[PDB]
C-alpha cells in the first residue's frame, strides 16, 4: 500500500502577454492512488470551466493528469493551482509565475 | 488495436 | 526513427456499491488516440485523434467489445487479489495494466512489453524474451503458474509481434501528417537578477514533439550540474511539450555559460548563449 505525493507545475500553454487569449495548465504527476482533486484559481476564487485529460500513468506506475482552462493574462490578475490528495493534510497551492 | 482476449490473475 | 504503441488500463474498486471505475487509453508514441471511460455516457471506445476517425464502425464495435471484456477481467482481478492479500472488503484498491510494442526506424518489431501492478506495486510482468514471467511475490507466483499452465505468454507474443506491430504500421501511415512529423524545439534564454552579485539564466524549449529531449548547461566548454535546476518535461495541451533548465551564475559572468539542446527534430545539437 504505497502513497505518493503529487508534483505540480502551473504554466500557460503559450507565451504569456497581458491581453491575449491563452490557456492555463495545471500538470500533476507522480501520485498514487488516483483519487485527486484539482482546481484552477483566479484571484483566490475557483474557476468553473475546467477540462482535464484522461488518466494515465508512467512506467513506475504513478498517475499523471493535465487540468486546463482558457484564460487571459493581465498585469494584475493572479492565477493559481490548488491540489488536494490523501497524502496532503493541507491543500497545496502553487501560484502561476510567468516571470519564469 | 487492442489485444483480443484477457486472463484473470 | 523509432515508434511505439502502448495501451494503459486502470481499475479502482468502489466499496459500498457497484463495479470499479475503469479507464483505458491508447497511445501512439506521445499522442493519445483512443479512450474508454466507464463513467462516460457513450459506453464506447472513443476517438481522440483525427486520423483514427477514418476507421469504420466494425473497428469501433470490435474495440469496444474487447475493452469491455478487459474491465470485467479487471473487476474479477480486484476480487481475487483482495483474497490473495487477506485485505478487507472496505478499502479501495487499484489494478493497473500496460502493454504495447516498439519498432525501430524500419518499423520492424524491436521490443514488446506487458505488465501488471496492484496498488501501485509490481505484480507480474512478461520478460524481454516474451516467453516467461517475473512474479514479484508469492501471490504473483500463484498467478504465474496459472498463466504458464494456460499458455498466456504464447498468445501475447503472437499479438505483440503480430497484430500490434501491423496496426502500428497502419496508424503511422494513415496518420503521417502528424505521426511522422517531428516538431523541433523553439528555444530562447531568459535572464533574472536575484541579488546584486548573482544571476539566473533559463533556457527554454517549447512546442517540440516528440517528448524525449536533452537540455544541458556548459561552463567554459565543460558540463555543469551544480547550481542548475531541471524541470520535468510537461505537456503544453496542444500535443506538444515544454521543458526548461536553469543555472545560477555570478553577475557579469553570463557569457561563459551555454545551454545545449538535443532533439530528434534537430539535425545537430543547438547551442544558445546570453
Radius of gyration of chain A: 14 Å
Element pattern of chain A in H and E: EEEEEEEEE
DSSP summary, beta strand count of chain A: 9
Number of strands of chain C: 17
CATH topology of chain A: Immunoglobulin-like
CATH architecture of chain A: Sandwich
Radius of gyration of chain C: 23 Å
Helix count, DSSP H or I runs of 4 or more residues of chain C: 5
Number of domains of chain A: 1
Strand content of chain C: 35-45%
- The coarse silhouette of chain A is elongated
- How is the biggest beta sheet of chain A arranged? 5 strands, antiparallel
| CATH fourth-tier homologous superfamily of the largest domain in chain C | MHC class I-like antigen recognition-like
> Which structural class should the secondary elements of chain C be placed in?
alpha+beta
CATH superfamily of chain A: Immunoglobulins
Spatial strand arrangement across the major sheet of chain C: 4-3-2-1-5-6-7-8
Oligomer: heterotrimer
Largest sheet of chain C: 8 strands, antiparallel
Q: What shape does the CA trace of chain C take?
A: globular
Distance between the termini of chain C: 32 Å
**CATH class categorisation of chain A:** Mainly Beta
Q: What do you see in this structure?
A:
The complex is a heterotrimer of chains A (100), B (9) and C (274). Chain A has 100 residues and is mainly β. Chain A has a single domain, classed as Immunoglobulin-like (Sandwich). In chain A, 0% of the residues lie in helices and 47% in strands. In chain A, strands 1, 2, 5, 6 and 7 form a five-stranded antiparallel beta sheet that branches. Chain B is mostly loops and 9 residues long. Chain B has no helices and no strands. Chain C folds into two domains: 1-181, Murine Class I Major Histocompatibility Complex, H2-DB, Chain A, domain 1 (2-Layer Sandwich); 182-270, Sandwich (Immunoglobulin-like), CATH 2.60.40.10. Chain C has five helices and 17 strands. Chain C has helices spanning 50-53, 57-84, 138-149, 152-174, 176-179; strands at residues 3-12, 21-28, 31-37, 46-47, 94-103, 109-118, 121-126, 133-135, 186-193, 198-208, 214-219, 222-223, 228-230, 234-235, 241-250, 257-262, 270-272. Classes of the chains: A mainly beta (100), B little secondary structure (9), C alpha+beta (274). Chain A binds chain C through residues 1-2, 4, 7, 9, 11, 13-15, 23, 25, 27, 29, 32-35, 53-57, 61-63, 66, 68, 99-100, and chain C through 8, 10, 12, 23, 25, 27, 32, 35, 37, 48, 92, 94, 96, 98, 117, 119-122, 190, 192, 202, 206, 231-232, 234-238, 242, 244. The PDB classes it as immune system. The entry lists the keywords MHC class I, HLA, immune system, immune response, nonapeptide, viral peptide, hepatitis C virus, NS3 protein. It forms a trimeric assembly.
Amino acid at each position: 500500500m504505497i502513497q505518493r505525493t503529487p508534483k505540480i507545475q502551473v504554466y500557460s500553454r503559450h507565451p504569456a502577454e497581458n491581453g491575449k487569449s491563452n490557456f492555463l495548465n495545471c500538470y500533476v504527476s507522480g501520485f498514487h492512488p488516483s483519487d485527486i482533486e484539482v482546481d484552477l484559481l483566479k484571484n483566490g476564487e475557483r474557476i468553473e470551466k475546467v477540462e482535464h485529460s484522461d488518466l494515465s500513468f508512467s512506467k513506475d506506475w504513478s498517475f499523471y493528469l493535465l487540468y486546463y482552462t482558457e484564460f487571459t493574462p493581465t498585469e494584475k490578475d493572479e492565477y493559481a493551482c490548488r491540489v488536494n490528495h490523501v497524502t496532503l493534510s493541507q491543500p497545496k497551492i502553487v501560484k502561476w509565475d510567468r516571470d519564469m | 488495436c487492442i489485444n483480443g482476449v484477457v486472463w484473470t490473475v | 526513427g523509432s515508434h511505439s504503441m502502448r495501451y494503459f488500463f486502470t481499475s479502482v474498486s468502489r466499496p459500498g456499491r457497484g463495479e470499479p471505475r475503469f479507464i483505458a487509453v491508447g497511445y501512439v508514441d506521445d499522442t493519445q488516440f483512443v479512450r474508454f471511460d466507464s463513467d462516460a455516457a457513450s459506453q464506447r471506445m472513443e476517438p481522440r485523434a483525427p486520423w483514427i476517425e477514418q476507421e469504420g464502425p466494425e473497428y469501433w464495435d470490435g474495440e469496444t467489445r474487447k475493452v469491455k471484456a478487459h474491465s470485467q477481467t479487471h473487476r474479477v482481478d480486484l476480487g481475487t487479489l483482495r483474497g490473495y492479500y487477506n485485505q478487507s472488503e472496505a478499502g479501495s484498491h487499484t489494478v493497473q495494466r500496460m502493454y504495447g510494442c516498439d519498432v525501430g526506424s524500419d518499423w520492424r518489431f524491436l521490443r514488446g512489453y506487458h505488465q501488471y501492478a496492484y496498488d501501485g506495486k509490481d505484480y507480474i510482468a512478461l520478460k524481454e524474451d516474451l516467453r516467461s514471467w517475473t512474479a514479484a511475490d508469492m501471490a504473483a507466483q500463484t498467478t504465474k503458474h496459472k498463466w504458464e499452465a494456460a499458455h498466456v505468454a504464447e498468445q501475447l507474443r503472437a499479438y505483440l509481434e503480430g497484430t500490434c506491430v501491423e496496426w502500428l504500421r497502419r496508424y503511422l501511415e494513415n496518420g503521417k501528417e502528424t505521426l511522422q512529423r517531428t516538431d523541433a524545439p523553439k528555444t530562447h534564454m531568459t535572464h533574472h537578477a536575484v541579488s546584486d552579485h548573482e544571476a539566473t539564466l533559463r533556457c527554454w524549449a517549447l512546442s517540440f514533439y516528440p517528448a524525449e529531449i536533452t537540455l544541458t548547461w556548459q561552463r567554459d566548454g565543460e558540463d555543469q550540474t551544480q547550481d542548475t535546476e531541471l524541470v520535468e518535461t510537461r505537456p503544453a495541451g496542444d500535443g506538444t511539450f515544454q521543458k526548461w533548465v536553469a543555472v545560477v551564475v555570478p553577475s557579469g559572468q553570463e557569457q561563459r555559460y551555454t545551454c545545449h539542446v538535443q532533439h530528434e527534430g534537430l539535425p545537430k545539437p543547438l547551442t544558445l548563449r546570453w
